[PDB]
Every structure is written in C-alpha cells, then in structure tokens.
Design a protein around this ligand. Sequence first.
Ligand SMILES: [Zn+2]
Lengths: 73, 73, 30
Amino acid sequence: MQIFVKTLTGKTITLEVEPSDTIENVKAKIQDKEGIPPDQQRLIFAGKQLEDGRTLSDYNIQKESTLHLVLRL
Amino acid sequence: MQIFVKTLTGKTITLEVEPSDTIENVKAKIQDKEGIPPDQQRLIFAGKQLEDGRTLSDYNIQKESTLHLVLRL
Amino acid sequence: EGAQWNCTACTFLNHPALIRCEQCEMPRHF
Ligand SMILES: [Zn+2]
C-alpha cells in the first residue's frame, strides 16, 4: 500500500509499505528517498509521536494515510 | 437541527442535520450542499478529528455547534 | 513547552513537535 509523508516545507514523499512494517522500516525508506538519517527523523500521526519498534497497524495507519516528518538536531 | 460548518476562509455554512446523524451522513449532506466529495472532507470538533461511523451526539455536537471543515486531497 | 496545542484555525489538538497544524498547515506561531 501507499502512504504519504509531509514535511514542514510542504514536500510530499510517497512510500510503499505493508501494514506490518515497523516505524524503523519507514524511517529507512525515507532515508532512501530523501537522504535524512533515521536518527534525525521524528514521525507524527494523529497527534502522536510514533515509536521505532511498533508497526503501522499498531497506529491504525491505512492505505493513503499521511504522516508528518519532523527533524531533530 | 442546525449546525455550522466553518471553512478555513472563515465562511460559515449552515447545515440541517439530525442529532443522531453519523459523521458519514454529515459528509454526504456537505456534498449535497457544497459539492465537495466526502473523501476530500476532514471535519474537526473541539480538538478531535471526527470518525465516519460515530454519531454527532456521540461527540457532544448539538444545535449551533461549529465543525471545522478542512479539505484534504 | 512539552504540551499539546490547539490550532487556532481548525482547533485540532497537535503534538508539540509540529509548528504547523497536522490537519490544515496553519502555523502555531502566527
Ligand atoms: Zn488546523
């Protein structure tokens, strides 16, 4: 399935994921598209920060959902 | 029962609904009045993103409450 | 500083790590 990732600048990233994928898998897919190291990524959905070891299904993230990507420093 | 639906331009639409209507029913009524497809509508009330299968009463939405309509697309 | 914040445009209750609303992209610090 496709999900979307939006950044503060308005960039949109499309990823191919399965609902069983972990958040750490999603961060590595973002690195492949954008070059941002996973340890500098923070992902937000539905007002909540997503944890690396949980899965997309844990957060009820479905086909065509949009995640928000923030950066650390 | 009348509720108000406020867009991001400040335009307030008056909508006739029943107090037991589901959110999906409300999105259908916005489609009928404004011409916006339900899949492009996101409704927010007092902090919460409204889910399609629940009723207005289940969110404590009542006469002359305001819902905020965000277009998502 | 760690609290959630409501968007002044659509009311959505946002995570503190966002400085624009997750629903409507309205900036927090207008
Ligand atoms: Zn908002």
